[PDB]
Amino acid sequence: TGKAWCCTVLSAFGVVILSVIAHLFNTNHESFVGSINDPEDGPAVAHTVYLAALVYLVFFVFCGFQVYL
Amino acid sequence: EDFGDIMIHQVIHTIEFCLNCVSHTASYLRLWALSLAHAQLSSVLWTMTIQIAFGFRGFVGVFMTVALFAMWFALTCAVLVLMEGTSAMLHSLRLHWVESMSKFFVGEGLPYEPFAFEYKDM
Amino acid sequence: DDILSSIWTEGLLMCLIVSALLLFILIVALSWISNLDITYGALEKSTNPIKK
Amino acid sequence: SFSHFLYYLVLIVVIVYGLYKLFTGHGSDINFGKFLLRTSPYMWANLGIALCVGLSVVGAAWGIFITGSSMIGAGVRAPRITTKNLISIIFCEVVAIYGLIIAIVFSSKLTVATAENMYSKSNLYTGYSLFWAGITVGASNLICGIAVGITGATAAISDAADSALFVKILVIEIFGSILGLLGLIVGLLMAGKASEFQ
Amino acid sequence: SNIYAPLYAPFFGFAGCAAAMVLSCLGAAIGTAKSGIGIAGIGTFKPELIMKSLIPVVMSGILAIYGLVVAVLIAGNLSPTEDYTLFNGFMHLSCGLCVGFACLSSGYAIGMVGDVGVRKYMHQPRLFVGIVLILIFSEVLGLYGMIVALILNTRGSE
Amino acid sequence: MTELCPVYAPFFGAIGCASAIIFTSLGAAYGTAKSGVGICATCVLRPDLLFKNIVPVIMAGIIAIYGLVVSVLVCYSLGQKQALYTGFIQLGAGLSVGLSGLAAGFAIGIVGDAGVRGSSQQPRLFVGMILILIFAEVLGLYGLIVALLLNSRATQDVV
Amino acid sequence: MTELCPVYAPFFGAIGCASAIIFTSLGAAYGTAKSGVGICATCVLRPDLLFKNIVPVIMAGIIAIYGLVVSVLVCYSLGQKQALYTGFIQLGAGLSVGLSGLAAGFAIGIVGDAGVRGSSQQPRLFVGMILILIFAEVLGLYGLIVALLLNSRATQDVV
Amino acid sequence: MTELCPVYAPFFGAIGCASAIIFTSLGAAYGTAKSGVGICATCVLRPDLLFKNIVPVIMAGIIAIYGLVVSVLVCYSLGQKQALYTGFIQLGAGLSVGLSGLAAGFAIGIVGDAGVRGSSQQPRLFVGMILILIFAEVLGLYGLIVALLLNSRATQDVV
Amino acid sequence: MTELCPVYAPFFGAIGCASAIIFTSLGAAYGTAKSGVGICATCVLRPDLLFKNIVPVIMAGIIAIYGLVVSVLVCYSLGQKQALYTGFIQLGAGLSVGLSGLAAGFAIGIVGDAGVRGSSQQPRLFVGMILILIFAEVLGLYGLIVALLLNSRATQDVV
Amino acid sequence: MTELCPVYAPFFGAIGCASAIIFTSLGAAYGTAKSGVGICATCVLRPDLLFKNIVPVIMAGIIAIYGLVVSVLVCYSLGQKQALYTGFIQLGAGLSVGLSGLAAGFAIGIVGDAGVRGSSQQPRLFVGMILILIFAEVLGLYGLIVALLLNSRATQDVV
């Protein structure tokens, strides 16, 4: 029900947006690390965000079985 | 007396048509304003919520990225789509009813309501 | 000796008319708010054995 | 009362203070000329731009609930009017647009000036003008907005009575709208010769 | 340089250009708003009598044309290169107060009379000319304020 | 620049020229209006007394002509170089006719709105309403006499 | 200019001249207004009493004459070069006759409206109304006795 | 001019001589009015009580004669070259009789209206209100004592 | 410290930052309470319209997010040593969005209160309120645009 | 002793500390007093709803904590020798949380008095009262945010 669809579509695109973000920090894209106030180390931030996306991936597969049944 | 009714309808038509060319052209500036506002709220929403999490590391940094993204995504889906979409949608409607349709739309027509049976909900 | 004053400098005066301005607005906004009154009739339960 | 007592206790201190300085040979100490000269012309110019778009929005928002609260009541029995009487909400919004066109024109005139040439003939001229022009456009559109709301609350009630009468009262509602357009003109003429701060 | 031409004198010239509009528009607003209440009020009984009873609203509009004229002329005699004397600014301040309060006065009389007359005109149609005559006395009050405000302008400069 | 003749001296004359138009007009607008309401109410029943009850409004227009005279007449006396004495006297001339003509208005308005309603009933009251209005119109004429004497002295024996 | 005779001295005099005719005209106007409203009601049903009932209006009108003769005597004592002593007194002469006549004007209107409505019900009340108005009209005379003594002292033994 | 005798010294005397007769008149006018309404309303049906109920109007007129005495004494004491002390005493003398005469005027107008309306219904009540008026008319007699007693000191032992 | 960088200069920024959330909060409270009482009156008999009639309560919450957006942008332009050019910019921005949202907010309350009551009686009258109510929420926006134009010019070419 | 750091700089900081707890307690108090009357009227008939309508009294109290927090923080920024800039930051913080919290209390007071009563005739209305009160609680949260961002900048990069 709606209690499960919510974290399914939410965590669907958390897997997508956070992974596209982490790809860019890793490759040191200018818009994400170009200014001084941006973080100094690109890949260190990506390591922290690859893991955050996996946490949403677990909520996705779990709630997928919940609604599927 | 009928010559008067053809005049007073013709004297009001001009004083409107001339003024309204100045007030309609100015109305279209809401295209600029609602664009600028939508853009700034989006950046402020990014700069307060997700830009913060990237400055953390460890298990505690991982948790904030999970918590802060959800609040970004939710305020985004509600404040910047529903609240802003319904505003802009109704301003687009205004420019048709009041600006475009004034130029050519006469109105006062009779509708078409034929006689037909239908299921009556009771 | 072309000063305006030692006590009532131009910098103090500009800051006291702006305070006066922002306070004038505030005092108005709190007059509109105080005059709010609740519409109690549509909340109470009223029934009569004459009409009903 | 209390609020009116203070208005009369201010008048009595301004008088006793003026006569203290005068009888003592110090009436020159109360000098409005220096205050106008020594105060910064950026103060006067940034009040006017704020009191133009601010006082214009007060008027527009005002007329929208006089015209809006009567239409909704009249619209219970005659729900067909809320789109025909909509034109009154349009002439009340548009005076706010006038206060935003000014602030576009006047904001261009906000530039930084050297410290030696700050209190010059031209930069004082330019602060005085953007102040009274903003007052002019704002206080005049405040009046055009309240008026058009009154006119358009009646035109809602007449239209619910009879569809024909709506057209006849619009003529009153057009002439009221001229007031805001004249104010815009007068302001632009004031600030026509004003030059950006050097 | 000149003691007769300080650099704050423009402050008093714009003050009159603003007082000629804010106070003259406030007169026109009071005439149209109050008259239109009387015109729309009868409109549920006698629609025929509206298209002749717009005389009170077009007199209120002329009041706003008086302040436009005075404000235009004042702004024409202002510049940041001209030597603008202090004498000239006190005149421009009184050019504006005169026509402003005089047109604020005309708009109060036109609204009160125009309201009652229309509401009472539907009962009696022979009352019309007397209403119009009373509305002419309320209009010349705004003319007296600008016959004065065009002399002051002429003498302030020269 | 002289001590007798400062640069701020014309200020006091300007406020006198303007005071005479401000407080007469507000006095003529009050009387014209209220007299105009009492006339309209009666003429529904009796519109044959319309051009005879417009006398209160004429009285109140003579009040506003009292104030145009003075303002016109002191404005020809204004100058870049003048003395404070000339300014203090022009302010007095305007406040006199101004605030004394405001008084006549509040009388002519109260009496007119009553004697017009009462003359429709008893026609013998139309010559009582005119005596009383004469005693009201005379109040603004006294303030005009004072002004014309003050204005005469403003440029008399002055340096 | 001089220590005893500075430039701003005519201001208080020019304001003392107007204050006499301003505040008497306001009092004389509160009189004719209310008494006029009472007259125009009673004389609907009893017109014969119209001429008798104009007496309160005449009493209010004589008030404004007190503020005129004082304002005239002050005009002819003004000057570009006069002393503050002469200028302060002229203010106290004008406030006295001015704000006294204002008080006589409110008494007369409130009494003149009461006794005139009640004298059409009882004629004997008429000589009593008059006797009460004399006390209220003599208040403005005390303010005139004080003004006239002052003005006669404003130019006495002065440098 | 001098340390102990400035030029702005007579300002406080003229405001004394004025303020004395002003407030006693405002006080005597409240009483003559609020009592005048009660007399006329009652003496329609009891017109022989008329000359016996005019006592409050007389007493209120005695208040105004207290302000005349003080004003005339202060007037003769005014001079171009007087000390501030002599002026402060003139101000306090006028403020004392004046603002004490308002109160007596209020106290006489409230009691006159009640005891005149009652004296019609009960004759024995007429002798009772007069006492209550003595205890009011003597309040103003106290402000006179102080004023007369101050002005004695305004001039003696003064440089 | 300098002619162009005084020490009272940040006062106009801090007072401007504060007044943007103060004036917009007050507006969104007048418009939440006022609207909110109609919802608590119609949904005693028509509980099925509850979620549809919270739309006025939404529109006022957006007025408050605007004032928060301006307080956040002017705050990061503050400094101990900033010009007086910069300070008055920071002022006009807060005075614009604040005074504009306060006015918009009150209209949302008055119009939203009436709509919820009417649409309960006429379900065709909901869309008519949704139209009228957008022209109020857009006036808080027109104040926001001015604040943004000015902030751009804040620290441009400053020295 | 220093131009940047005067002796009067703590004056603005202490007012800012006092003003944050004062204007939140006035709003927090209106909310309890106003919504506490409604609870006591409904729960004489139905006290089964007593531990369910305390929510407006909870939320009015959550405001008064938003000020206690801010007041504590600025109190630890105070010092005998500090920049005048730091004093302005402190005042802006206290007003913003205060006058925005006063606004939140007026709303909570109205909607909770009208809501508890209407919920006594319709239980489905409780769920809407809860929403309308979150949009008012959040008006005070915004003022806290502006306060803590200001205080963050109070002592950094200051001499």
Short mmCIF file of C-alpha atoms in Angstrom, two decimals, chain G residues 3-4 83-85 88 92 95 99-100 103 110-111 115 121-122 124-125 131-132 135 139 142 146 150 153 157-159, chain H residues 7 10-11 17-18 21-22 25-26 28-29 32 37 40 44 47-48 50 54 57-58 64-65 68 75-76 78-80:
data_model
loop_
_atom_site.label_atom_id
_atom_site.label_comp_id
_atom_site.label_asym_id
_atom_site.label_seq_id
_atom_site.Cartn_x
_atom_site.Cartn_y
_atom_site.Cartn_z
CA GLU G 3 19.45 92.17 22.08
CA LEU G 4 16.19 93.82 23.13
CA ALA G 83 10.84 94.73 21.20
CA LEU G 84 9.92 91.26 22.43
CA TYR G 85 7.98 92.91 25.26
CA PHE G 88 4.78 88.88 23.82
CA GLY G 92 -1.45 87.47 25.39
CA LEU G 95 -5.29 84.48 23.31
CA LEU G 99 -10.20 81.75 23.91
CA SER G 100 -12.71 83.59 26.09
CA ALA G 103 -16.21 79.77 25.63
CA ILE G 110 -26.35 75.24 24.18
CA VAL G 111 -28.60 77.63 26.11
CA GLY G 115 -34.75 77.97 25.74
CA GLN G 121 -44.33 75.80 24.99
CA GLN G 122 -44.22 78.60 27.59
CA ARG G 124 -42.64 83.33 30.36
CA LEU G 125 -39.38 81.41 29.79
CA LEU G 131 -31.09 86.69 31.46
CA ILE G 132 -28.97 83.53 31.23
CA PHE G 135 -24.00 86.07 31.81
CA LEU G 139 -17.51 86.37 29.61
CA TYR G 142 -13.80 90.30 30.42
CA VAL G 146 -7.79 92.42 29.60
CA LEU G 150 -2.37 95.05 27.77
CA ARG G 153 0.86 98.87 28.04
CA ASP G 157 7.96 103.21 28.61
CA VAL G 158 9.75 100.96 26.11
CA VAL G 159 13.15 101.25 24.48
CA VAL H 7 14.66 89.42 27.60
CA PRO H 10 7.83 88.67 30.31
CA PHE H 11 6.80 85.56 28.34
CA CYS H 17 -2.33 87.18 32.80
CA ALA H 18 -3.91 85.30 29.91
CA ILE H 21 -9.19 84.72 32.60
CA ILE H 22 -9.16 81.87 30.07
CA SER H 25 -14.20 81.48 31.54
CA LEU H 26 -14.06 77.88 30.31
CA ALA H 28 -17.93 79.47 34.10
CA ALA H 29 -19.24 78.49 30.66
CA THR H 32 -23.83 78.36 32.83
CA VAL H 37 -30.50 73.16 30.18
CA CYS H 40 -35.47 75.54 30.83
CA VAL H 44 -42.01 74.92 31.29
CA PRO H 47 -42.54 78.92 35.57
CA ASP H 48 -42.72 80.61 39.00
CA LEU H 50 -37.61 80.63 37.50
CA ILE H 54 -31.00 81.18 38.59
CA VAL H 57 -25.78 80.86 36.90
CA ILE H 58 -24.86 83.72 39.24
CA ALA H 64 -14.87 84.66 36.16
CA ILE H 65 -14.45 87.79 38.28
CA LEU H 68 -10.22 89.34 36.12
CA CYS H 75 -0.77 93.33 34.07
CA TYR H 76 0.42 96.30 36.11
CA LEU H 78 4.64 93.53 33.72
CA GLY H 79 7.69 95.44 32.56
CA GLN H 80 10.22 95.33 29.78
#
